[PDB]
Amino acid sequence: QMPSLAPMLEKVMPSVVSINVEGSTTVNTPRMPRNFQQFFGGQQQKFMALGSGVIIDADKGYVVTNNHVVDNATVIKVQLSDGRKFDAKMVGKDPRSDIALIQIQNPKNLTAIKMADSDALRVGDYTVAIGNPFGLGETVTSGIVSALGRENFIQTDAAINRGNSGGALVNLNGELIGINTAILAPDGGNIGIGFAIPSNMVKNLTSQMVEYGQVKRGELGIMGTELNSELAKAMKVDAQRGAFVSQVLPNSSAAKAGIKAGDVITSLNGKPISSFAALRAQVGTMPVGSKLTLGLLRDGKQVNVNLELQQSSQNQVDSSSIFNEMSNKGKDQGVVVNNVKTGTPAAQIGLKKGDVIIGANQQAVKNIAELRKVLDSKPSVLALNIQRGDSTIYLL
Amino acid sequence: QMPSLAPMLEKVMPSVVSINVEGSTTVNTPRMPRNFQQFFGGQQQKFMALGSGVIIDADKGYVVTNNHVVDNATVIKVQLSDGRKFDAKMVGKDPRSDIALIQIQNPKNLTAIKMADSDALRVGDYTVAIGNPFGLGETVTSGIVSALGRENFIQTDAAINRGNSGGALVNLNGELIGINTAILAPDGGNIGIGFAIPSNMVKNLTSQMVEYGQVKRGELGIMGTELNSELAKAMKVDAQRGAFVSQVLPNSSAAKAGIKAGDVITSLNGKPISSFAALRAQVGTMPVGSKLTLGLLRDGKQVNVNLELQQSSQNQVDSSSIFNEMSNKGKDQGVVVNNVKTGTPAAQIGLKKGDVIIGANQQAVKNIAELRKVLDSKPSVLALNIQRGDSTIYLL
Amino acid sequence: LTSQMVEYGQVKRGELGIMGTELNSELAKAMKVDAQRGAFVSQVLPNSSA
Amino acid sequence: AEVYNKDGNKLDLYGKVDGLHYFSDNKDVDGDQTYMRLGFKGETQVTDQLTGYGQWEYQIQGNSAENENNSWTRVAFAGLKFQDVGSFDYGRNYGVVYDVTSWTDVLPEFGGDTYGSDNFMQQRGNGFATYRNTDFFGLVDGLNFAVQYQGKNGNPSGEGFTSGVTNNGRDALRQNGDGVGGSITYDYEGFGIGGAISSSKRTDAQNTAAYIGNGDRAETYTGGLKYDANNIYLAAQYTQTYNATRVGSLGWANKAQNFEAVAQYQFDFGLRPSLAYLQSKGKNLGRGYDDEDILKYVDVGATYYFNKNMSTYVDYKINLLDDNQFTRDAGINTDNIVALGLVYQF
């Protein structure tokens, strides 16, 4: 009869799930009355998000999805394409790539998609996207590979006018080639065409979340922008062709090793750095503990140093199956906890600002994957062998 | 395995180039301060444009592109798909069709696309567009022939949401069927679907630029609009169903032969003229020196006359390989120069407002193609045998 | 200083030909300068030694 | 007067007739000055939180013969208001600088003339888009702010201009490019404090040799103070302007410093005497004018209120400007004026 994508879609759909997130966040307190002819310029607020995800491990119930959907989640629900409902928990997330991993709680009879090799993609190749555009459900749209970046973001015309960046990008064989994302951050929604992380990168970032707790991406800990910013002018910067350092992050390697706002990096390991962009991307091709010597500019300053795990990708209330923001520290040198909060449920448990945890409630916790591997096997007695540098206490 | 457009795209891409234009224009002088709650109502300003083009003559390095990209260019750069960079110079342009021709300076090993026969196009036919949507590079998108006008603008759904009107429209065989354009002038960007000039028209307009210097399109030299305009009401026009003459252009045939603002043309060579539109399009199906008698309306006025080359498509600093706005005059009766400027680099050379150039620095210059053919072969001694009607001087 | 004007036409004072100011200026901020504790070079004078 | 109030729509039809006469040695202002104003304010309840409104006000001179008509629109705008958030309106309205300077524009007849109408964002003008926030989302009683945009009002159409035209174009003394401004005021009990800033692009027609005060933009900076309690009204405003203050017909002042102060008292029996001082000092004017007074006068007057609908007043403008070349060239009035008015209003 007539050609159709329905035959492979039937072998694919069981792997695509819907995701309903419920969570809260801090919003500013509304000042009243409200005057709409007056252009001006803390409380938790619940919000609801919804997106798609792809079953990537049928046994473990591992579902890949966008970080812009599950971010700040308190409750994450998943509904299979056959209608069965499950609960899910955060296992990992990485805001850079806008990719996150979750785990269906109590999976039973699941189907996982097969991942194809991103590296074999070519522009005229056919593409099919599957997502939940406006909430009304699971929509599939078709097209082709528009641009192969060459980070290799995949570009495709199988998008959706005014809709939210769905999820799965699949080839004509039903294999996963990329997860569609949203490059319009803290928004969701597209620029006109579609951007996907390639399947090979998805596989890679995803395994890290599993086997470590987070992705090994080191940060230079500087924060800044281009040489056009109001501060590059309001501070008049000499020789403009590089990355403007607006501030050096606290307790960072850039901070520790030496550097101060103003200097404009001009190179990284000999190579020219013409824009924060160039730099932000280059430092992203280097895993923790790496050493990268870069040239700065004040009069003619330059240094060499080693970076540590970034702070963007971190964990929260999913390490201890219970409930309560740690992350990994250097190589397999335990799990270092970061900025504690105000509610202080975890600080209340004797955990400060820089407390490592090499003791797996008794054993070795070189990382959050392991640590969490124990706070899930023996939920009975828990004594966190934490040692924030000196103090080696054992709280419950 | 699976079908793909990648195999023909690989035979097509070497013909698609990227284009970077740098140029300036006259902007009004900003009045300060700036009050955003105050709806109000000369200096050159540099701008940058970027677009795509298609190699149409491998030997001569002839690239077709949109006039909205190269217009006002001072510097036009071209980058092949393999990454080789070249410089280019204007050889022709035609704002009506929004089509322009350029020439790569110093081509070496180029590939030209094959042009297919536009006339054989049909609506369900498959289509593929190639362009540079948001600057980020060369994107290809696919689809079909939506509407075949029947001027035969081609309509296709292979466009891009919110992006700039790319360039090449190719069939499934990799042959050029149309150059995508922008009908949202002095903007670029689409209405929702794509509009392309058909390949056969591209071939035709393009050869004219080569073999004459510009396209032979005669203008009636009137300027005006519909019978709805504020001026058709503010001046109360009797019997409204035609083209409103807001003004008769200076030194024009409409002017010379006889006509004055107000009269509403009702016909052109016997046929009814119900809208400026109808008329603007009809006068565009007539090459210079043609004779077209039309009926006007004041009380009942009508005349007959012969038109000359339009003023929209003209040349500038590309006739003399050097640097400095002429155009063709009637048949092969030399090259007549038009409105000189303020910087006066060319006026400074003894060239007034109406100076013809039949002398090819020694020979025959029936047209800009020829003239420019000489100011490129012998760049040594140059004596412009110009004669602006009477004065037959010989400047350097 | 006075004798110099007499016996030379002007006073022998060499310039480094730079022109600029402190690290507080709007241009030191609008251009974000790293390590601030010195003289900001806003421009190097033409045909100068600098 | 509210003439309609039904099913959530209200219409107030208001106006006045001011039988008014000027006495002055200056015969260009001397004589009958009778006029009327008419207007309406309407409001419609959309929801419990959202209200729509519109206002229109018109002045018709009553001092001309019947073969002519001298009348104009003062304001004309439509808007939306949301409870405890803000309001927005668009049309002919007052510039946000007037939020502060209006505080001294309380004199029986004169006053309020260190600026004028169609004078960038200083008073009434066309094409104002105005956003206002009252009481800061209802969380700070008495604190109000506003941000305003004005679109270009350029050269007249159909007169052979080749640039700078708008549909509603006009003479250069009444033109403006795009503008933006803002105001903040705080009122606690009887006291008030306020500030405003405006910045408007100036058009090419305004920046010709035919006008003094050429400049890229017109800017104004205003501070004001008020006291309004216990039958006493006191207010003062100070404004610094750049290429914004008109100097009669000559053009604008490169810089001007404007000051206005008023003192008023309300007797129980209905008499309200008023004392005021206004001055506008221009600097670096060009054409050899250098520093000159643009305006300088003491105003003494009184209004008698019979009730809320009928009043009568006398206002005496004691004009401290002296007759000189500068004031002659600019056409600035230097004579005293006595005004006598009798006003019915509804």
Side-chain angles (χ1 to χ4, degrees), chain A residues 1-164 166-396, chain B residues 1-164 166-396, chain C, chain D:
Chain A
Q1 310 58 50
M2 29 201 269
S4 181
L5 297 175
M8 80 77 171
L9 290 183
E10 287 172 16
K11 301 191 281 122
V12 168
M13 289 302 294
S15 299
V16 174
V17 320
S18 320
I19 294 180
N20 260 63
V21 176
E22 173 179 313
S24 67
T25 170
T26 280
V27 60
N28 302 308
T29 299
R31 303 273 158 45
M32 247 86 286
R34 280 338 298 206
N35 210 308
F36 77 74
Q37 56 183 303
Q38 162 175 156
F39 29 66
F40 73 153
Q43 43 174 164
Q44 284 313 83
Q45 241 54 294
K46 297 191 180 190
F47 67 85
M48 288 182 258
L50 118 201
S52 288
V54 174
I55 291 173
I56 237 51
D57 179 349
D59 264 51
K60 285 285 192 67
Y62 282 148
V63 174
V64 66
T65 184
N66 311 86
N67 155 271
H68 69 267
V69 190
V70 311
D71 201 338
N72 280 302
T74 297
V75 171
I76 124 78
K77 280 171 182 190
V78 172
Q79 184 165 192
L80 299 179
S81 85
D82 69 3
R84 286 143 75 203
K85 293 183 67 185
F86 297 84
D87 285 323
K89 321 246 279 190
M90 270 293 323
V91 26
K93 76 184 213 149
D94 175 48
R96 259 289 189 84
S97 66
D98 177 46
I99 291 261
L101 230 213
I102 67 171
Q103 217 188 186
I104 297 169
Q105 288 315 85
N106 303 314
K108 164 123 184 170
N109 308 301
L110 251 41
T111 304
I113 198 157
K114 172 189 183 307
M115 270 174 270
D117 184 3
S118 298
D119 290 326
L121 286 182
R122 293 193 294 172
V123 174
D125 286 339
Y126 285 118
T127 253
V128 57
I130 309 175
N132 179 163
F134 319 86
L136 333 162
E138 299 302 77
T139 324
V140 6
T141 197
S142 94
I144 64 170
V145 169
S146 283
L148 240 12
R150 219 79 93 157
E151 46 289 294
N152 182 33
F153 260 109
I154 296 191
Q155 236 166 296
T156 185
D157 57 9
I160 357 68
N161 169 24
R162 301 180 116 85
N164 302 329
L169 218 231
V170 135
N171 65 35
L172 245 36
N173 268 345
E175 312 185 311
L176 183 73
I177 70 189
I179 262 54
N180 295 107
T181 175
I183 55 180
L184 273 197
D187 191 272
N190 34 284
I191 168 190
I193 199 180
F195 291 62
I197 307 286
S199 71
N200 286 181
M201 176 64 27
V202 190
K203 177 192 293 295
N204 181 86
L205 291 155
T206 226
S207 304
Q208 279 180 43
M209 324 197 146
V210 164
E211 317 160 27
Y212 298 127
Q214 74 190 175
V215 288
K216 250 64 201 318
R217 66 181 47 209
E219 74 184 351
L220 196 57
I222 77 88
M223 294 219 237
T225 48
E226 285 312 303
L227 296 162
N228 296 300
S229 51
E230 311 179 306
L231 291 188
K233 295 186 178 181
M235 298 192 264
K236 334 216 72 173
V237 286
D238 309 301
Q240 301 182 56
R241 39 92 207 309
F244 188 27
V245 185
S246 181
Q247 47 161 155
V248 60
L249 269 182
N251 296 159
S252 68
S253 184
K256 194 299 177 67
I259 264 187
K260 290 181 182 178
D263 315 309
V264 188
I265 292 67
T266 310
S267 53
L268 206 200
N269 285 356
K271 299 107 84 59
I273 295 298
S274 37
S275 61
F276 192 64
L279 209 187
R280 206 166 64 63
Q282 281 199 198
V283 285
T285 298
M286 298 148 201
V288 202
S290 291
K291 287 185 174 303
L292 67 180
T293 182
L294 7 55
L296 285 170
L297 195 166
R298 215 187 86 64
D299 324 301
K301 319 297 181 181
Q302 178 169 173
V303 203
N304 69 326
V305 295
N306 138 287
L307 38 51
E308 62 263 51
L309 207 304
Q310 172 174 162
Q311 83 289 52
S312 275
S313 54
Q314 303 162 303
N315 321 274
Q316 289 96 313
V317 304
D318 85 67
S319 292
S320 302
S321 49
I322 188 66
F323 175 101
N324 299 67
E325 292 180 57
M326 305 88 94
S327 72
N328 289 303
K329 182 64 180 181
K331 12 289 182 179
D332 299 66
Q333 296 179 181
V335 182
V336 150
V337 51
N338 303 306
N339 279 300
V340 291
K341 280 308 305 172
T342 302
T344 53
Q348 265 176 41
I349 204 64
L351 279 48
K352 199 178 175 183
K353 292 182 175 182
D355 309 46
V356 193
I357 300 187
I358 328 289
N361 173 48
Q362 62 243 50
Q363 266 225 183
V365 163
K366 53 213 283 184
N367 60 45
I368 309 173
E370 275 188 352
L371 176 280
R372 187 163 47 184
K373 178 116 182 179
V374 184
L375 309 192
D376 162 58
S377 59
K378 57 161 300 188
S380 60
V381 179
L382 173 63
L384 291 320
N385 318 45
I386 82 175
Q387 38 277 313
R388 51 181 192 56
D390 299 299
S391 62
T392 307
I393 41 182
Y394 311 104
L395 295 300
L396 301 173
Chain B
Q1 310 58 50
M2 29 202 269
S4 181
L5 297 175
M8 80 77 171
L9 290 183
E10 287 172 16
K11 301 191 281 123
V12 168
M13 289 302 294
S15 299
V16 174
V17 320
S18 320
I19 294 180
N20 260 63
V21 176
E22 173 179 313
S24 67
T25 170
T26 280
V27 60
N28 302 308
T29 299
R31 303 273 158 45
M32 247 86 286
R34 280 338 298 206
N35 210 308
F36 77 74
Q37 56 183 303
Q38 161 175 156
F39 30 66
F40 74 153
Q43 43 174 164
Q44 284 313 83
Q45 241 54 294
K46 297 191 180 190
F47 67 85
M48 288 182 257
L50 118 201
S52 288
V54 174
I55 291 173
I56 237 51
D57 179 349
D59 264 51
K60 285 285 192 67
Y62 282 148
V63 174
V64 66
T65 184
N66 311 86
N67 155 271
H68 69 267
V69 190
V70 311
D71 201 338
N72 280 302
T74 297
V75 171
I76 124 78
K77 280 171 182 190
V78 172
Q79 184 165 192
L80 299 179
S81 85
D82 69 3
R84 286 143 75 203
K85 293 183 67 185
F86 297 84
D87 285 323
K89 321 246 279 190
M90 270 293 323
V91 26
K93 76 184 213 149
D94 175 48
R96 259 290 189 84
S97 66
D98 177 46
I99 291 261
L101 230 213
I102 67 171
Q103 217 188 186
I104 297 169
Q105 288 315 85
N106 303 314
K108 164 123 184 170
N109 308 301
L110 251 41
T111 304
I113 197 157
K114 172 189 184 307
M115 270 174 270
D117 183 3
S118 298
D119 290 326
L121 287 182
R122 293 193 294 172
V123 174
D125 286 339
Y126 285 118
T127 253
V128 57
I130 309 175
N132 179 163
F134 319 86
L136 333 162
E138 299 302 77
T139 324
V140 6
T141 197
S142 94
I144 64 170
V145 169
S146 283
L148 240 12
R150 219 79 93 157
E151 46 289 294
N152 182 33
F153 260 109
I154 296 191
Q155 236 166 296
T156 185
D157 57 9
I160 357 68
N161 169 24
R162 301 180 116 85
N164 302 329
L169 217 231
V170 135
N171 65 36
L172 245 36
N173 268 345
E175 312 185 311
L176 183 73
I177 70 189
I179 262 54
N180 295 107
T181 175
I183 55 180
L184 273 197
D187 191 272
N190 34 284
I191 168 190
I193 199 180
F195 291 62
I197 307 286
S199 71
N200 286 181
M201 176 64 27
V202 190
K203 177 192 294 295
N204 181 86
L205 291 155
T206 226
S207 304
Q208 279 180 43
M209 324 197 146
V210 164
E211 317 160 27
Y212 298 127
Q214 74 190 175
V215 288
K216 250 64 201 318
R217 65 181 47 209
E219 74 184 351
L220 196 57
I222 77 88
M223 294 219 237
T225 48
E226 285 312 303
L227 296 162
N228 296 300
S229 51
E230 311 179 306
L231 291 188
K233 295 186 178 181
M235 298 192 264
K236 334 216 72 174
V237 286
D238 309 301
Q240 301 182 56
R241 39 92 207 309
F244 188 27
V245 185
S246 181
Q247 47 161 155
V248 60
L249 269 182
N251 296 159
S252 68
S253 184
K256 194 299 177 67
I259 264 187
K260 290 181 182 178
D263 315 309
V264 188
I265 292 67
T266 310
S267 53
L268 206 200
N269 285 356
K271 299 107 84 59
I273 295 298
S274 37
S275 60
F276 192 64
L279 209 187
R280 206 166 64 63
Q282 281 199 198
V283 285
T285 298
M286 298 148 201
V288 202
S290 291
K291 287 185 174 303
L292 67 180
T293 182
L294 7 55
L296 285 170
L297 195 166
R298 215 187 86 64
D299 324 301
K301 319 297 181 181
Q302 178 169 173
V303 203
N304 69 326
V305 295
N306 138 287
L307 38 51
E308 63 262 51
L309 207 304
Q310 172 174 162
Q311 83 289 52
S312 275
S313 54
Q314 303 162 303
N315 321 274
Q316 289 96 314
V317 304
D318 85 67
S319 292
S320 301
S321 49
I322 188 66
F323 175 101
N324 299 67
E325 292 180 57
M326 305 88 94
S327 72
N328 289 303
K329 182 64 180 181
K331 12 289 182 179
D332 299 66
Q333 296 179 181
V335 182
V336 150
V337 51
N338 302 307
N339 279 300
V340 291
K341 279 308 305 172
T342 302
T344 53
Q348 265 176 41
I349 204 64
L351 279 48
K352 199 178 175 183
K353 292 182 175 182
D355 309 46
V356 193
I357 300 187
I358 328 289
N361 173 48
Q362 62 243 50
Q363 266 224 183
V365 163
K366 53 213 283 184
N367 60 45
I368 309 173
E370 275 188 352
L371 176 280
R372 187 163 47 184
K373 178 116 182 179
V374 184
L375 309 192
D376 162 58
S377 59
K378 57 161 300 188
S380 60
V381 179
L382 173 63
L384 290 320
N385 318 45
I386 82 176
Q387 38 277 313
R388 51 181 192 56
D390 299 299
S391 62
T392 307
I393 41 182
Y394 311 104
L395 295 300
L396 301 173
Chain C
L1 292 155
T2 226
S3 304
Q4 279 180 43
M5 324 197 146
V6 164
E7 317 160 27
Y8 298 127
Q10 74 190 175
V11 288
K12 250 64 201 317
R13 65 181 48 209
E15 74 184 351
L16 196 58
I18 77 88
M19 294 219 237
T21 48
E22 285 312 303
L23 296 162
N24 296 300
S25 51
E26 311 179 306
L27 291 188
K29 295 186 178 181
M31 298 192 264
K32 334 216 72 173
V33 286
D34 309 301
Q36 301 182 56
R37 39 92 207 309
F40 188 27
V41 185
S42 181
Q43 47 161 155
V44 60
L45 269 182
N47 296 159
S48 68
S49 184
Chain D
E2 189 174 77
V3 298
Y4 189 81
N5 184 330
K6 195 179 181 167
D7 327 298
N9 192 231
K10 305 154 62 273
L11 187 69
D12 164 83
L13 180 61
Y14 69 95
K16 63 158 171 182
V17 187
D18 188 348
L20 181 63
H21 195 93
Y22 282 18
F23 302 88
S24 181
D25 286 347
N26 184 356
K27 301 303 158 202
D28 301 331
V29 305
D30 186 48
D32 185 33
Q33 291 281 359
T34 297
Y35 74 92
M36 71 87 63
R37 287 195 190 126
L38 184 79
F40 70 78
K41 311 172 210 139
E43 291 181 350
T44 177
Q45 183 186 355
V46 172
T47 58
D48 56 348
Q49 313 118 307
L50 184 62
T51 302
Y53 58 91
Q55 184 172 341
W56 174 76
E57 195 170 288
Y58 199 65
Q59 179 162 331
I60 303 175
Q61 292 297 111
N63 64 345
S64 69
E66 284 173 29
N67 63 337
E68 75 181 68
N69 177 59
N70 299 314
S71 63
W72 56 89
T73 293
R74 287 161 56 84
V75 304
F77 61 87
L80 301 164
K81 203 208 303 169
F82 198 92
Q83 187 190 269
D84 299 345
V85 171
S87 72
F88 169 79
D89 44 68
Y90 179 82
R92 183 169 181 86
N93 207 346
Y94 284 87
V96 283
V97 166
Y98 195 71
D99 293 348
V100 185
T101 55
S102 67
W103 282 347
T104 58
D105 191 15
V106 289
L107 307 184
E109 177 58 17
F110 305 112
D113 55 342
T114 58
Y115 49 91
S117 294
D118 307 294
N119 182 204
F120 304 107
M121 313 184 73
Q122 293 174 91
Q123 199 224 58
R124 290 180 302 273
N126 301 113
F128 284 128
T130 309
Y131 298 81
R132 298 181 171 284
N133 187 303
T134 69
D135 293 21
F136 195 75
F137 308 92
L139 281 69
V140 186
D141 284 351
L143 180 57
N144 287 357
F145 62 86
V147 182
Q148 190 179 63
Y149 304 96
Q150 189 181 28
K152 186 180 191 312
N153 300 300
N155 286 324
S157 59
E159 291 191 29
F161 285 98
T162 87
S163 56
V165 170
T166 55
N167 84 91
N168 65 329
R170 72 284 307 271
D171 64 272
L173 289 174
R174 293 173 182 81
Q175 289 186 33
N176 63 270
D178 290 343
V180 60
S183 73
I184 310 184
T185 64
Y186 181 60
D187 286 275
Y188 182 64
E189 304 188 4
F191 298 90
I193 179 165
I197 182 179
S198 71
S199 182
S200 299
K201 207 176 192 306
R202 278 165 60 81
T203 78
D204 289 344
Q206 301 179 313
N207 288 320
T208 65
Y211 302 110
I212 61 168
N214 292 184
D216 206 289
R217 302 181 73 86
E219 296 106 331
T220 80
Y221 304 83
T222 305
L225 289 176
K226 177 187 65 145
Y227 178 81
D228 189 359
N230 302 2
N231 298 318
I232 296 156
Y233 189 85
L234 298 176
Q237 74 94 354
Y238 176 73
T239 290
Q240 210 153 108
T241 64
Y242 300 88
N243 309 303
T245 297
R246 288 155 180 156
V247 190
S249 68
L250 292 183
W252 300 263
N254 277 324
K255 281 199 194 146
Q257 293 171 328
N258 303 336
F259 176 78
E260 310 187 0
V262 55
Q264 305 192 326
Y265 187 83
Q266 181 72 60
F267 289 104
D268 56 356
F269 71 89
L271 189 62
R272 194 187 178 89
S274 174
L275 184 71
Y277 177 72
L278 294 77
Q279 61 164 42
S280 173
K281 294 207 182 301
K283 349 210 98 306
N284 192 15
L285 280 38
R287 298 179 184 176
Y289 294 130
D290 298 345
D291 292 33
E292 291 286 332
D293 294 349
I294 297 174
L295 186 79
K296 192 181 187 192
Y297 71 89
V298 169
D299 193 86
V300 57
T303 302
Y304 182 77
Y305 295 94
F306 299 94
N307 59 22
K308 293 180 180 180
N309 298 99
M310 198 82 206
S311 66
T312 184
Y313 62 82
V314 54
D315 212 354
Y316 182 35
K317 188 205 286 274
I318 306 156
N319 200 333
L320 303 182
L321 294 182
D322 291 311
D323 178 15
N324 60 36
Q325 189 63 279
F326 165 75
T327 62
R328 270 180 271 129
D329 299 345
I332 293 164
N333 177 52
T334 70
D335 297 299
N336 304 342
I337 313 171
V338 170
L340 265 171
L342 183 62
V343 185
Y344 171 80
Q345 59 186 44
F346 63 92

